[PDB]
């Protein structure tokens, strides 16, 4: 979607492997603010939105 009508998707009730996101070189920018990128596989979350 466009930036004025940005699409928000809820993510819930799943087990997420973030290691395929860190190790992928396709992303020019992979920058996290409130959490470490390498610790995402060790933590549990709710209220996940994309």
């Amino acid at each position: 979607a466009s930036v004025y009508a940005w699409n928000r998707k809820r993510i819930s009730n799943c087990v997420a492997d973030y290691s395929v996101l860190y190790n992928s070189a396709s992303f020019s920018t992979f920058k996290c603010y409130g959490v470490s990128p390498t610790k995402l596989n060790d933590l549990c979350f709710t209220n996940v939105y994309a």
């Binding site: 928000r8 809820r10 819930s12 209220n47 939105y49």
Partner: protein
């Protein structure tokens, strides 16, 4: 998150609210993520 807290109490007062204390237990924690500004309750008709 839309939180619904509920409590059921056996009462015997005829018209107004009873005077007492009853804590409402949380019933449903609901993941909606939408804007709510106005509401309306639903009643049931009786047809004879």
């Amino acid at each position: 998150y839309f939180k619904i807290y509920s409590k059921h109490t056996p009462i015997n007062l005829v018209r107004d609210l009873p005077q007492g204390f009853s804590a409402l237990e949380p019933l449903v924690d609901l993941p909606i993520g939408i804007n709510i500004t106005r509401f309306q309750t639903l009643l049931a008709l009786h047809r004879s």
